[PDB]
Amino acid sequence: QQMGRGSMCDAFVGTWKLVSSENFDDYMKEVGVGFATRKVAGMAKPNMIISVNGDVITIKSESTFKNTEISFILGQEFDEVTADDRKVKSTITLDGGVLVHVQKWDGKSTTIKRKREDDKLVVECVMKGVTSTRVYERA
Ligand SMILES: CC(C)Cc1ccc([C@H](C)C(=O)O)cc1
């Protein structure tokens, strides 16, 4: 085994904490999340842990609502059970410097984008015409 080199994806790696959220309840409504789940999920201030090991990216969300973990290879679709218990087919790619996560279920689709902006990790969640912006800071 030799030490691998880095990647552009290293800008995402680390431990992040949610510091702001806008329009998340409206995004969740558009997604189809029920009232009680929306209320509890909207209160959560997760930590998000992003790591890379070879071609495998792991995104771990630790919260008081749910914990989730996904591991994947860019461009390669996988099964995901979301925090609100949708069973989706997901593909994550890069669009420039943006991690683009598309989730498909029940004939619906939503896109989550993660991008570095200054010292922040900005998350855009889009369902149809509804966008929510969530901002993480280094933990
Ligand atoms: C709560 C439900 C809609 C699933 C869910 C949970 C977290 C997030 C964003 C990506 C984040 O990690 O802050 C989007 C969607």
Side-chain angles (χ1 to χ4, degrees), residues 3-139:
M3 195 167 290
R5 263 97 92 108
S7 80
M8 205 231 59
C9 222
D10 293 337
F12 293 106
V13 165
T15 311
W16 301 91
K17 63 172 182 265
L18 187 65
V19 295
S20 72
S21 182
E22 292 280 357
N23 213 46
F24 195 59
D25 185 63
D26 285 348
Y27 167 77
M28 285 191 293
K29 285 184 181 199
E30 205 75 1
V31 166
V33 184
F35 175 91
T37 300
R38 283 203 315 283
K39 293 297 133 183
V40 170
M43 290 293 297
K45 321 231 192 350
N47 276 27
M48 178 178 51
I49 304 165
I50 299 178
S51 61
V52 184
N53 185 145
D55 299 330
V56 185
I57 305 167
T58 302
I59 301 179
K60 184 178 192 164
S61 180
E62 297 194 311
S63 81
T64 43
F65 168 53
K66 295 291 159 194
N67 301 315
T68 62
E69 180 181 333
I70 61 172
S71 299
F72 57 93
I73 298 172
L74 294 165
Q76 304 196 1
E77 160 192 85
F78 61 98
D79 294 309
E80 175 177 12
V81 177
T82 68
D84 60 311
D85 210 24
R86 283 170 286 134
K87 288 74 160 137
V88 305
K89 299 285 178 180
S90 286
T91 313
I92 303 177
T93 60
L94 282 161
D95 177 14
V98 180
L99 281 166
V100 180
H101 181 183
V102 183
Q103 298 174 335
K104 307 290 195 181
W105 78 107
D106 257 283
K108 299 172 192 160
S109 180
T110 189
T111 299
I112 299 168
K113 293 184 176 182
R114 294 172 173 92
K115 194 178 197 184
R116 281 293 310 282
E117 300 283 358
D118 299 325
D119 292 318
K120 295 312 199 188
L121 193 167
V122 181
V123 185
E124 184 202 66
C125 307
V126 172
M127 168 107 215
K128 292 150 67 192
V130 179
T131 304
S132 169
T133 299
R134 288 164 74 86
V135 178
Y136 288 78
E137 286 177 356
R138 296 276 184 184

PDB file of all heavy atoms in Angstrom, residues 22-23 26-31 109-111 124-133:
ATOM      1  N   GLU A  22     -32.811  28.199   5.768  1.00  0.00           N
ATOM      2  CA  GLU A  22     -33.869  29.020   5.172  1.00  0.00           C
ATOM      3  C   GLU A  22     -34.775  28.161   4.316  1.00  0.00           C
ATOM      4  O   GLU A  22     -34.296  27.408   3.480  1.00  0.00           O
ATOM      5  CB  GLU A  22     -33.286  30.144   4.304  1.00  0.00           C
ATOM      6  CG  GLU A  22     -32.554  31.208   5.144  1.00  0.00           C
ATOM      7  CD  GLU A  22     -33.507  32.213   5.816  1.00  0.00           C
ATOM      8  OE1 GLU A  22     -34.730  32.140   5.597  1.00  0.00           O
ATOM      9  OE2 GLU A  22     -33.040  33.075   6.593  1.00  0.00           O
ATOM     10  N   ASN A  23     -36.062  28.299   4.520  1.00  0.00           N
ATOM     11  CA  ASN A  23     -37.091  27.672   3.700  1.00  0.00           C
ATOM     12  C   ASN A  23     -37.126  26.143   3.759  1.00  0.00           C
ATOM     13  O   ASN A  23     -37.692  25.496   2.902  1.00  0.00           O
ATOM     14  CB  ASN A  23     -37.016  28.134   2.237  1.00  0.00           C
ATOM     15  CG  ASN A  23     -38.386  28.209   1.568  1.00  0.00           C
ATOM     16  OD1 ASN A  23     -39.347  28.739   2.145  1.00  0.00           O
ATOM     17  ND2 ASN A  23     -38.465  27.774   0.325  1.00  0.00           N
ATOM     18  N   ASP A  26     -40.718  24.490   3.936  1.00  0.00           N
ATOM     19  CA  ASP A  26     -41.331  24.577   2.596  1.00  0.00           C
ATOM     20  C   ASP A  26     -40.703  23.519   1.664  1.00  0.00           C
ATOM     21  O   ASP A  26     -41.429  22.883   0.896  1.00  0.00           O
ATOM     22  CB  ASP A  26     -41.272  25.980   1.974  1.00  0.00           C
ATOM     23  CG  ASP A  26     -42.310  26.978   2.623  1.00  0.00           C
ATOM     24  OD1 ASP A  26     -43.191  26.532   3.355  1.00  0.00           O
ATOM     25  OD2 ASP A  26     -42.250  28.160   2.352  1.00  0.00           O
ATOM     26  N   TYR A  27     -39.385  23.294   1.742  1.00  0.00           N
ATOM     27  CA  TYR A  27     -38.777  22.246   0.911  1.00  0.00           C
ATOM     28  C   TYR A  27     -39.325  20.879   1.274  1.00  0.00           C
ATOM     29  O   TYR A  27     -39.712  20.068   0.444  1.00  0.00           O
ATOM     30  CB  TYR A  27     -37.239  22.311   1.109  1.00  0.00           C
ATOM     31  CG  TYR A  27     -36.539  21.068   0.538  1.00  0.00           C
ATOM     32  CD1 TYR A  27     -36.356  20.932  -0.798  1.00  0.00           C
ATOM     33  CD2 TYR A  27     -36.093  20.096   1.399  1.00  0.00           C
ATOM     34  CE1 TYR A  27     -35.755  19.771  -1.304  1.00  0.00           C
ATOM     35  CE2 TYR A  27     -35.499  18.902   0.896  1.00  0.00           C
ATOM     36  CZ  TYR A  27     -35.348  18.780  -0.455  1.00  0.00           C
ATOM     37  OH  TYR A  27     -34.736  17.622  -0.922  1.00  0.00           O
ATOM     38  N   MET A  28     -39.366  20.621   2.549  1.00  0.00           N
ATOM     39  CA  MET A  28     -39.866  19.363   3.080  1.00  0.00           C
ATOM     40  C   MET A  28     -41.341  19.169   2.704  1.00  0.00           C
ATOM     41  O   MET A  28     -41.736  18.047   2.333  1.00  0.00           O
ATOM     42  CB  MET A  28     -39.723  19.270   4.576  1.00  0.00           C
ATOM     43  CG  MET A  28     -38.269  19.000   5.052  1.00  0.00           C
ATOM     44  SD  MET A  28     -38.120  18.579   6.817  1.00  0.00           S
ATOM     45  CE  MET A  28     -38.603  20.170   7.550  1.00  0.00           C
ATOM     46  N   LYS A  29     -42.150  20.247   2.760  1.00  0.00           N
ATOM     47  CA  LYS A  29     -43.555  20.116   2.296  1.00  0.00           C
ATOM     48  C   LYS A  29     -43.599  19.691   0.853  1.00  0.00           C
ATOM     49  O   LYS A  29     -44.397  18.821   0.485  1.00  0.00           O
ATOM     50  CB  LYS A  29     -44.303  21.439   2.459  1.00  0.00           C
ATOM     51  CG  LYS A  29     -44.669  21.746   3.900  1.00  0.00           C
ATOM     52  CD  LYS A  29     -45.487  23.012   3.950  1.00  0.00           C
ATOM     53  CE  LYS A  29     -45.873  23.421   5.307  1.00  0.00           C
ATOM     54  NZ  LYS A  29     -46.968  24.341   5.286  1.00  0.00           N
ATOM     55  N   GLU A  30     -42.757  20.297   0.014  1.00  0.00           N
ATOM     56  CA  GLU A  30     -42.750  20.021  -1.455  1.00  0.00           C
ATOM     57  C   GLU A  30     -42.341  18.595  -1.678  1.00  0.00           C
ATOM     58  O   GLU A  30     -42.871  17.946  -2.559  1.00  0.00           O
ATOM     59  CB  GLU A  30     -41.868  21.045  -2.204  1.00  0.00           C
ATOM     60  CG  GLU A  30     -42.216  21.255  -3.658  1.00  0.00           C
ATOM     61  CD  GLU A  30     -43.486  22.090  -3.880  1.00  0.00           C
ATOM     62  OE1 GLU A  30     -44.140  22.556  -2.914  1.00  0.00           O
ATOM     63  OE2 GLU A  30     -43.842  22.269  -5.058  1.00  0.00           O
ATOM     64  N   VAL A  31     -41.416  18.086  -0.861  1.00  0.00           N
ATOM     65  CA  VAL A  31     -40.958  16.699  -0.923  1.00  0.00           C
ATOM     66  C   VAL A  31     -42.058  15.714  -0.545  1.00  0.00           C
ATOM     67  O   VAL A  31     -42.110  14.629  -1.066  1.00  0.00           O
ATOM     68  CB  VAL A  31     -39.666  16.493  -0.050  1.00  0.00           C
ATOM     69  CG1 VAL A  31     -39.336  15.035   0.213  1.00  0.00           C
ATOM     70  CG2 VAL A  31     -38.490  17.233  -0.717  1.00  0.00           C
ATOM     71  N   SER A 109     -38.340  13.641  -8.050  1.00  0.00           N
ATOM     72  CA  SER A 109     -36.897  13.847  -7.992  1.00  0.00           C
ATOM     73  C   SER A 109     -36.621  15.093  -7.176  1.00  0.00           C
ATOM     74  O   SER A 109     -37.338  16.055  -7.273  1.00  0.00           O
ATOM     75  CB  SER A 109     -36.382  14.052  -9.423  1.00  0.00           C
ATOM     76  OG  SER A 109     -35.010  14.261  -9.516  1.00  0.00           O
ATOM     77  N   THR A 110     -35.537  15.074  -6.410  1.00  0.00           N
ATOM     78  CA  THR A 110     -35.042  16.247  -5.698  1.00  0.00           C
ATOM     79  C   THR A 110     -33.524  16.250  -5.828  1.00  0.00           C
ATOM     80  O   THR A 110     -32.904  15.190  -5.939  1.00  0.00           O
ATOM     81  CB  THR A 110     -35.493  16.220  -4.224  1.00  0.00           C
ATOM     82  OG1 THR A 110     -35.168  17.487  -3.610  1.00  0.00           O
ATOM     83  CG2 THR A 110     -34.902  15.070  -3.379  1.00  0.00           C
ATOM     84  N   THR A 111     -32.951  17.454  -5.792  1.00  0.00           N
ATOM     85  CA  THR A 111     -31.520  17.628  -5.958  1.00  0.00           C
ATOM     86  C   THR A 111     -30.985  18.417  -4.747  1.00  0.00           C
ATOM     87  O   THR A 111     -31.528  19.466  -4.399  1.00  0.00           O
ATOM     88  CB  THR A 111     -31.196  18.359  -7.282  1.00  0.00           C
ATOM     89  OG1 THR A 111     -31.673  17.572  -8.377  1.00  0.00           O
ATOM     90  CG2 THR A 111     -29.707  18.532  -7.432  1.00  0.00           C
ATOM     91  N   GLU A 124     -27.797  23.465  -0.918  1.00  0.00           N
ATOM     92  CA  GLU A 124     -29.015  23.902  -1.613  1.00  0.00           C
ATOM     93  C   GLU A 124     -29.849  22.626  -1.828  1.00  0.00           C
ATOM     94  O   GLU A 124     -29.343  21.597  -2.269  1.00  0.00           O
ATOM     95  CB  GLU A 124     -28.681  24.645  -2.903  1.00  0.00           C
ATOM     96  CG  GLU A 124     -29.870  25.221  -3.656  1.00  0.00           C
ATOM     97  CD  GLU A 124     -29.604  25.488  -5.169  1.00  0.00           C
ATOM     98  OE1 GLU A 124     -29.388  24.529  -5.947  1.00  0.00           O
ATOM     99  OE2 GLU A 124     -29.638  26.662  -5.593  1.00  0.00           O
ATOM    100  N   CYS A 125     -31.093  22.666  -1.390  1.00  0.00           N
ATOM    101  CA  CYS A 125     -32.033  21.582  -1.590  1.00  0.00           C
ATOM    102  C   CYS A 125     -33.156  22.110  -2.439  1.00  0.00           C
ATOM    103  O   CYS A 125     -33.829  23.064  -2.080  1.00  0.00           O
ATOM    104  CB  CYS A 125     -32.600  21.120  -0.201  1.00  0.00           C
ATOM    105  SG  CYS A 125     -31.354  20.702   1.022  1.00  0.00           S
ATOM    106  N   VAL A 126     -33.404  21.423  -3.535  1.00  0.00           N
ATOM    107  CA  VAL A 126     -34.334  21.888  -4.525  1.00  0.00           C
ATOM    108  C   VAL A 126     -35.373  20.804  -4.843  1.00  0.00           C
ATOM    109  O   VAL A 126     -35.024  19.653  -5.155  1.00  0.00           O
ATOM    110  CB  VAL A 126     -33.665  22.327  -5.878  1.00  0.00           C
ATOM    111  CG1 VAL A 126     -34.659  22.601  -6.889  1.00  0.00           C
ATOM    112  CG2 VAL A 126     -32.784  23.501  -5.710  1.00  0.00           C
ATOM    113  N   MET A 127     -36.634  21.197  -4.764  1.00  0.00           N
ATOM    114  CA  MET A 127     -37.721  20.341  -5.218  1.00  0.00           C
ATOM    115  C   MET A 127     -38.658  21.259  -5.968  1.00  0.00           C
ATOM    116  O   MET A 127     -39.284  22.148  -5.427  1.00  0.00           O
ATOM    117  CB  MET A 127     -38.397  19.660  -4.034  1.00  0.00           C
ATOM    118  CG  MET A 127     -39.710  18.973  -4.361  1.00  0.00           C
ATOM    119  SD  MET A 127     -39.471  17.211  -4.342  1.00  0.00           S
ATOM    120  CE  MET A 127     -40.599  16.714  -5.672  1.00  0.00           C
ATOM    121  N   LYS A 128     -38.691  21.014  -7.264  1.00  0.00           N
ATOM    122  CA  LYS A 128     -39.452  21.785  -8.180  1.00  0.00           C
ATOM    123  C   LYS A 128     -39.008  23.248  -8.022  1.00  0.00           C
ATOM    124  O   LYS A 128     -37.821  23.596  -8.134  1.00  0.00           O
ATOM    125  CB  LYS A 128     -40.958  21.509  -7.981  1.00  0.00           C
ATOM    126  CG  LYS A 128     -41.351  20.082  -8.385  1.00  0.00           C
ATOM    127  CD  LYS A 128     -42.522  19.536  -7.602  1.00  0.00           C
ATOM    128  CE  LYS A 128     -43.813  20.257  -7.905  1.00  0.00           C
ATOM    129  NZ  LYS A 128     -44.866  19.872  -6.899  1.00  0.00           N
ATOM    130  N   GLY A 129     -39.935  24.130  -7.725  1.00  0.00           N
ATOM    131  CA  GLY A 129     -39.593  25.553  -7.631  1.00  0.00           C
ATOM    132  C   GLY A 129     -39.224  25.973  -6.248  1.00  0.00           C
ATOM    133  O   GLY A 129     -39.030  27.137  -5.990  1.00  0.00           O
ATOM    134  N   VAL A 130     -39.148  25.026  -5.310  1.00  0.00           N
ATOM    135  CA  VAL A 130     -38.817  25.344  -3.923  1.00  0.00           C
ATOM    136  C   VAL A 130     -37.389  25.016  -3.619  1.00  0.00           C
ATOM    137  O   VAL A 130     -36.942  23.872  -3.812  1.00  0.00           O
ATOM    138  CB  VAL A 130     -39.750  24.641  -2.948  1.00  0.00           C
ATOM    139  CG1 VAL A 130     -39.389  24.956  -1.488  1.00  0.00           C
ATOM    140  CG2 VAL A 130     -41.217  25.018  -3.221  1.00  0.00           C
ATOM    141  N   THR A 131     -36.651  25.995  -3.122  1.00  0.00           N
ATOM    142  CA  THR A 131     -35.269  25.855  -2.744  1.00  0.00           C
ATOM    143  C   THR A 131     -35.121  26.157  -1.242  1.00  0.00           C
ATOM    144  O   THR A 131     -35.658  27.181  -0.730  1.00  0.00           O
ATOM    145  CB  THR A 131     -34.380  26.801  -3.521  1.00  0.00           C
ATOM    146  OG1 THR A 131     -34.591  26.561  -4.897  1.00  0.00           O
ATOM    147  CG2 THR A 131     -32.893  26.643  -3.168  1.00  0.00           C
ATOM    148  N   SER A 132     -34.339  25.382  -0.562  1.00  0.00           N
ATOM    149  CA  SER A 132     -33.891  25.663   0.783  1.00  0.00           C
ATOM    150  C   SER A 132     -32.391  25.722   0.833  1.00  0.00           C
ATOM    151  O   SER A 132     -31.719  24.919   0.214  1.00  0.00           O
ATOM    152  CB  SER A 132     -34.366  24.582   1.772  1.00  0.00           C
ATOM    153  OG  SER A 132     -33.758  24.660   3.036  1.00  0.00           O
ATOM    154  N   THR A 133     -31.848  26.681   1.579  1.00  0.00           N
ATOM    155  CA  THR A 133     -30.422  26.870   1.717  1.00  0.00           C
ATOM    156  C   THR A 133     -30.021  26.652   3.145  1.00  0.00           C
ATOM    157  O   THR A 133     -30.601  27.235   4.078  1.00  0.00           O
ATOM    158  CB  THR A 133     -30.004  28.293   1.324  1.00  0.00           C
ATOM    159  OG1 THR A 133     -30.366  28.487  -0.032  1.00  0.00           O
ATOM    160  CG2 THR A 133     -28.530  28.510   1.458  1.00  0.00           C
TER     161      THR A 133
END
